[PDB]
Scaffold this active site. Sequence first.
Site, PDB file in Angstrom:
ATOM      1  N   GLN A  93     -13.910   7.752  -7.031  1.00 29.07           N
ATOM      2  CA  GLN A  93     -12.702   8.421  -6.602  1.00 29.07           C
ATOM      3  C   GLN A  93     -12.720   9.865  -7.227  1.00 29.07           C
ATOM      4  OE1 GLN A  93     -10.317   5.448  -8.847  1.00 29.07           O
ATOM      5  NE2 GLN A  93      -9.182   7.152  -9.546  1.00 29.07           N
ATOM      6  N   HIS A 102      -4.011   0.915 -13.108  1.00 26.38           N
ATOM      7  CA  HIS A 102      -5.149   1.169 -12.232  1.00 26.38           C
ATOM      8  C   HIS A 102      -5.247   0.099 -11.167  1.00 26.38           C
ATOM      9  CE1 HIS A 102      -8.954   2.955 -11.425  1.00 26.38           C
ATOM     10  NE2 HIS A 102      -9.591   1.820 -11.591  1.00 26.38           N
ATOM     11  N   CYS A 143      -7.090   5.699  -6.743  1.00 25.46           N
ATOM     12  CA  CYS A 143      -7.468   4.290  -6.865  1.00 25.46           C
ATOM     13  C   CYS A 143      -6.674   3.427  -5.906  1.00 25.46           C
ATOM     14  CB  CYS A 143      -7.401   3.803  -8.335  1.00 25.46           C
ATOM     15  SG  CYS A 143      -5.930   4.333  -9.195  1.00 25.46           S
TER      16      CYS A 143
END
Length: 212
Positions: free
Chosen positions: A19, A159, A25
Amino acid sequence: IPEYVDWRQKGAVTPVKNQGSCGSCWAFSAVVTIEGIIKIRTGNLNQYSEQELLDCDRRSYGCNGGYPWSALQLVAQYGIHYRNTYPYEGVQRYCRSREKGPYAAKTDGVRQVQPYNQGALLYSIANQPVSVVLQAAGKDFQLYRGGIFVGPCGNKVDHAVAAVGYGPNYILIKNSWGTGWGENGYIRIKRGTGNSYGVCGLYTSSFYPVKN
């Protein structure tokens, strides 16, 4: 459900992506679940656009984070283009869906797995790739290079990643930090310890697309 599940082995998972320095993410995670369910339901393995969700999910915050469940909702509302037609830039831009032609895929809804339940999570993975969250900010998670990850890590989930399999003692996760991290971009996280949050709070918030 089987003892072992690996969607990579079943041909439902595309190459690992990076990314880069954009907290995209959420979009990467959502896209693994879409590539997975289209493969499961059609037989076709395609890559779809992270950049498109980045540009177009205005519930989310571009390069500053966002919600896998909002991205999934968008692909059910509108659809998504191929990665090829709408390639990743690692910067939020104008939503260009409109200019790229018809969408390449669209789903029939989004579901959430019961939180804090290893069992419910594992039954989902047995059916398809699922989007999950975990705490990635800890040094141990960042410096991981292989083996079954047992922590240390808390539960301040920050995340979004994709669960693409399991085995007797681990859940297999596809990350979006390129090949250079973990086991060629993957992590095996310990399971079955009786912890309700899951290791690094993995059983906090998990979703997947529905396709008829």
